[PDB]
Write an enzyme that holds these catalytic residues in place. Structure first.
Site, PDB file in Angstrom:
ATOM      1  N   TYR A 195       0.853  -1.195   0.000  1.00 20.76           N
ATOM      2  CA  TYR A 195       0.000   0.000   0.000  1.00 20.76           C
ATOM      3  C   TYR A 195       0.882   1.236   0.000  1.00 20.76           C
ATOM      4  O   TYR A 195       1.508   1.543   1.012  1.00 20.76           O
ATOM      5  CB  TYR A 195      -0.950   0.026   1.207  1.00 20.76           C
ATOM      6  CG  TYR A 195      -2.092  -0.968   1.108  1.00 20.76           C
ATOM      7  CD1 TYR A 195      -2.352  -1.651  -0.084  1.00 20.76           C
ATOM      8  CD2 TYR A 195      -2.925  -1.207   2.193  1.00 20.76           C
ATOM      9  CE1 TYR A 195      -3.401  -2.549  -0.186  1.00 20.76           C
ATOM     10  CE2 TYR A 195      -3.980  -2.106   2.099  1.00 20.76           C
ATOM     11  CZ  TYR A 195      -4.212  -2.770   0.910  1.00 20.76           C
ATOM     12  OH  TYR A 195      -5.252  -3.672   0.831  1.00 20.76           O
ATOM     13  N   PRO A 213     -17.712  -2.715   0.461  1.00 21.39           N
ATOM     14  CA  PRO A 213     -19.152  -2.615   0.734  1.00 21.39           C
ATOM     15  C   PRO A 213     -19.953  -1.931  -0.379  1.00 21.39           C
ATOM     16  O   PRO A 213     -21.094  -2.332  -0.632  1.00 21.39           O
ATOM     17  CB  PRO A 213     -19.194  -1.788   2.020  1.00 21.39           C
ATOM     18  CG  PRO A 213     -17.898  -2.138   2.719  1.00 21.39           C
ATOM     19  CD  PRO A 213     -16.890  -2.395   1.644  1.00 21.39           C
ATOM     20  N   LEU A 214     -19.365  -0.959  -1.066  1.00 19.74           N
ATOM     21  CA  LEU A 214     -20.131  -0.183  -2.048  1.00 19.74           C
ATOM     22  C   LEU A 214     -19.567  -0.132  -3.471  1.00 19.74           C
ATOM     23  O   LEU A 214     -19.931   0.756  -4.251  1.00 19.74           O
ATOM     24  CB  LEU A 214     -20.295   1.261  -1.544  1.00 19.74           C
ATOM     25  CG  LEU A 214     -21.517   1.476  -0.659  1.00 19.74           C
ATOM     26  CD1 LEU A 214     -21.680   2.939  -0.287  1.00 19.74           C
ATOM     27  CD2 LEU A 214     -22.715   0.977  -1.388  1.00 19.74           C
ATOM     28  N   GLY A 215     -18.688  -1.059  -3.828  1.00 22.19           N
ATOM     29  CA  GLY A 215     -18.134  -1.046  -5.174  1.00 22.19           C
ATOM     30  C   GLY A 215     -19.069  -1.457  -6.312  1.00 22.19           C
ATOM     31  O   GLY A 215     -19.873  -2.380  -6.181  1.00 22.19           O
ATOM     32  N   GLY A 216     -18.966  -0.742  -7.431  1.00 24.87           N
ATOM     33  CA  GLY A 216     -19.594  -1.122  -8.690  1.00 24.87           C
ATOM     34  C   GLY A 216     -21.109  -1.198  -8.831  1.00 24.87           C
ATOM     35  O   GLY A 216     -21.617  -2.066  -9.564  1.00 24.87           O
ATOM     36  N   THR A 276     -24.830   0.035 -10.173  1.00 26.26           N
ATOM     37  CA  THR A 276     -25.431   0.772 -11.284  1.00 26.26           C
ATOM     38  C   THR A 276     -26.226   1.962 -10.710  1.00 26.26           C
ATOM     39  O   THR A 276     -26.462   2.006  -9.497  1.00 26.26           O
ATOM     40  CB  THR A 276     -26.343  -0.138 -12.173  1.00 26.26           C
ATOM     41  OG1 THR A 276     -27.496  -0.569 -11.439  1.00 26.26           O
ATOM     42  CG2 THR A 276     -25.570  -1.347 -12.677  1.00 26.26           C
ATOM     43  N   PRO A 277     -26.603   2.947 -11.565  1.00 25.48           N
ATOM     44  CA  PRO A 277     -27.353   4.096 -11.043  1.00 25.48           C
ATOM     45  C   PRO A 277     -28.584   3.638 -10.302  1.00 25.48           C
ATOM     46  O   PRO A 277     -28.828   4.099  -9.201  1.00 25.48           O
ATOM     47  CB  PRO A 277     -27.735   4.872 -12.300  1.00 25.48           C
ATOM     48  CG  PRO A 277     -26.673   4.557 -13.257  1.00 25.48           C
ATOM     49  CD  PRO A 277     -26.289   3.120 -12.993  1.00 25.48           C
ATOM     50  N   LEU A 278     -29.307   2.690 -10.880  1.00 22.21           N
ATOM     51  CA  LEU A 278     -30.546   2.200 -10.289  1.00 22.21           C
ATOM     52  C   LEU A 278     -30.323   1.393  -9.020  1.00 22.21           C
ATOM     53  O   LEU A 278     -31.146   1.420  -8.116  1.00 22.21           O
ATOM     54  CB  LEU A 278     -31.320   1.356 -11.302  1.00 22.21           C
ATOM     55  CG  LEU A 278     -32.024   2.133 -12.425  1.00 22.21           C
ATOM     56  CD1 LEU A 278     -31.788   1.466 -13.779  1.00 22.21           C
ATOM     57  CD2 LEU A 278     -33.518   2.281 -12.142  1.00 22.21           C
TER      58      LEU A 278
END
Length: 282
Positions: free
Chosen positions: A56, A208-211, A213-215
């Site tokens: 890292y 937790p929040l990767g990738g 779609t808008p919807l």
């Protein structure tokens, strides 16, 4: 709540150190003072599982953990991952030769100020793509299994691996965790999670929040808003209820986000709400 990783009990809400480094996780963080403060707040907030790596921003994130927290309490498990190195283009390059793996374990020890590593993930990189792909990990793992025998590594884990590779690995050494791509969307590992659960082996979703779609993102925000929560808080809360062997390592350079991440343990997800969230990937 908690889980036993190797032989240490960890709080399932842990801390990923990946943000404590420059952009692309490369070079120094924007503000080393803030880095130090975040690590300290994390432990004060009850974190006792910190996920890191010596590739890292190479070496710098480990040294910040050391400056900030050494000497570490008995309570703390630091999980590190080897198997990759950093090109000077900030690329992430396969580094799994015996020399490289040993060098990686060695840098971790010096930069964290340790004699022994609690948990070491082998970050598998088969093929040209950016996720799990089939291929024998025996050579790499054997090298790790030996450093475990030499007493330098207490426990062995896996990062970015197929179910087959997990099976392979467990014939060679004991595996205490699997750290893969997984969240409310991307649920391909669902069955593996439950299988590992049965054997008391931890599963550690990357992001937790990767990738989304808008919807998909829009559905989460709807749900978060109704609950007075942040989408990341809903994301985390869902991960915690999904399976008792799941351990979270959300990363942030920000005390506020650290604080709101930690508050996710309190977020109560209704069965009705669970219905909506379970349907996001479908």
């Amino acid at each position: 709540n908690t889980f036993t990783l190797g032989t240490k009990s960890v709080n399932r809400l842990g801390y990923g150190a990946m943000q404590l480094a420059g952009p692309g996780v490369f070079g120094p963080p924007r503000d080393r003072h803030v880095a130090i403060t975040v690590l300290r707040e994390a432990l004060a907030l009850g974190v006792n599982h910190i996920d890191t790596s010596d590739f890292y921003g190479p070496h710098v994130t480990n040294q910040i953990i050391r400056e900030a927290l050494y000497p570490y309490s008995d309570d703390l498990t630091i999980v590190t991952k080897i198997g990759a190195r950093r090109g000077e283009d900030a690329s992430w390059l396969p580094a799994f030769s015996p020399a490289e793996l040993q060098k990686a374990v060695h840098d971790n020890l010096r930069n964290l100020g340790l004699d022994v590593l609690d948990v070491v993930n082998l970050r598998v990189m088969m093929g040209d793509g950016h996720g799990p792909a089939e291929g024998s990990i025996e050579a790499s793992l054997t090298v790790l299994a030996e450093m475990q025998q030499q007493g330098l590594v207490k426990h062995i884990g896996l990062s970015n691996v197929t179910p087959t590779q997990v099976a392979e690995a467990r014939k060679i050494a004991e595996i205490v965790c699997v750290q893969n791509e997984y969240n409310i969307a991307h649920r391909a590992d669902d069955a593996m999670i439950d299988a590992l659960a049965h054997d008391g082996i931890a599963y550690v979703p990357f992001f937790p929040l990767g990738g989304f779609t808008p919807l998909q993102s829009s559905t989460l925000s709807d749900v978060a808003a109704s609950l007075g929560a942040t989408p990341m808080q809903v994301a985390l809360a869902w991960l915690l209820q999904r399976s008792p062997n799941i351990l979270l390592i959300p990363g942030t350079s920000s005390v506020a986000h650290l604080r709101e991440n930690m508050a996710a343990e309190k977020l109560h997800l209704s069965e009705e709400v669970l219905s909506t969230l379970d349907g996001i990937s479908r």
